[model samples]
Target: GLMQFTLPVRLCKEIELFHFDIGPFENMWPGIFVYMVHRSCGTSCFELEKLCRFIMSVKKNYRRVPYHNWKHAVTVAHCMYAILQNNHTLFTDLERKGLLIACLCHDLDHRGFSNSYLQKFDHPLAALYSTSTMEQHHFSQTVSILQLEGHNIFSTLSSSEYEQVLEIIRKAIIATDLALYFGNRKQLEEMYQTGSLNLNNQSHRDRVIGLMMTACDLCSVTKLWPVTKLTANDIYAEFWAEGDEMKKLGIQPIPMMDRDKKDEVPQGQLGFYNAVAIPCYTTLTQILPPTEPLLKACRDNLSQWEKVIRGEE
Candidate 1:
């Protein structure tokens, strides 16, 4: 059971039927969460009062990191919401809600440390899981939140339904680990190429959902130029901070992680776009053409980064 905590209701009351497509809505996080739940899961599926408390509880769990904070979670949730809105036919209502909820909680309680950071230092989380340490921890944190007294928004669901949604959330969160994406992407591409990518198959659907988690997690790179720059800069800020920590321990940091190698940042961005972002969205769009706009935006940003690297911006 979740402990009791009072949340301010003013910000949420200001908007009814709010849609994240209007703008960033950074300040309306609680409101956005409420609206999204209502639209995706419906009022009957969740208790309105408990939903509000759950939202706040989830928000409180996220650390005050430069990136991977509550705002990033909201942005990722918004991206998933946008995707589901564009193609409702591809997923069931439960999946739509689970995907959004997973997005909101994917990075919960992150300490601004990468999984490699934990692994390299033999942190307890590393010892706890052989791989995907952070993501697995994130999923566990989500489960903990649900167990909180008033935070079980899925209370209305039957036991089987609850277990099914939890499984979806777990797989989706774990997929955010880029290491898994490499294997998932290769499989998805092969399936698409071989004409065996049937959404009717549970495995195929699960793989697509995994790819979707990555796309949403990295969607910051596909935003407007300034927005992407801000996000990219914040990401590097966290990385460089970690690099500084490792340097204190007499460890050499990779160029992208090294703060002293500022010049490498643009090239690093280009590499990420070329190697990860482009291919991710490219493959996803091939399977679900409705998501082409996201892929297009990512490509545009890649070109923008290319110009910057070439001294042509």
Candidate 2:
């Protein structure tokens, strides 16, 4: 029965408390600090709150499955927060808030698989969305929610303020497409090779936010020890479940999952860390040294995964 699967009241209360603590209402805005932070950095309290509400909605709608879920969204939010904190001086309040909100809302309503899955199944969403873009349709759905009459969180803003908010949101959300990763990384590499500490440039804020959000989205290898271990297990289970579903439909299992052979969690972890996470974090740290501890934690987690995979732990 549904009753058997429900969350306990105490746990529910705890979650509510956590949400309240992280939410904009509790943080408050338009005060001395808010004004000062805005003047010094450049973001608004109202816009930040709107972003938080959007994230909260995503969390509410999220399912705890593989690939895309609440945990992934929460992780992305946490990572974005950390990255922003590390480079606090570089961003205006507006830029930071916009980036954070974008990261938090980027994967709202994800279906636990790639866009390819929707297209292959002839899903209505696939039909409606253009094939040229990944996650564009999903991102649009999220933006549409903000336009609902009384539910419009940005309704209180002036027309100019509303336009600015929309522009930032679009730039940040669209940046999450994995198809753009290589190009983004190449740009970062070029900047590094030039030895330019051009963080002060306002023109680059979007690029900075985009790269940081993408880094967080790919941050499994950069987490603390036990947390990383736990996350890997969850991810593996989700992948296996997807494989099972595909098999039932007479489709070949994805690369990582095949019932005929054992799943190699460790190998997958190694490849992901070596090829993606390490280089990404290394580049991130070159721009922001305050992220050292987070990077170390990720390296440590990779070590732990290696040990576990080798049957040494």
The worst-scoring run of ten residues by lDDT in candidate 1 lies at 13-22
- Evaluate model 1: give its lDDT: 0.83
Clashing pairs in 2: 41-92, 41-93, 42-93, 42-94, 43-93, 43-94, 222-298
Q: 1-87, model 2: which lDDT tens digit per residue?
A: 111112345532432221111222322221322232243334535454554455456567666566576656655665666566556
lDDT of 1 by residue, 223-295 (tens): 8687788788889889999898778778898888899999888888888998899999999999888888888
Best-matching candidate per TM-score: 1
RMSD of each: 4.7, 8.1
* Cα lDDT, all candidates: 0.83, 0.61
- Candidate 1 displacement at residue 20 in angstroms: 6.8
User: Clash totals for all models, in order?
Assistant: 4, 7
Score every model by TM-score. Answer: 0.91, 0.75
State the displacement of the C-alpha of residue 141, model 1, in Å, after optimal TM-score superposition: 0.5
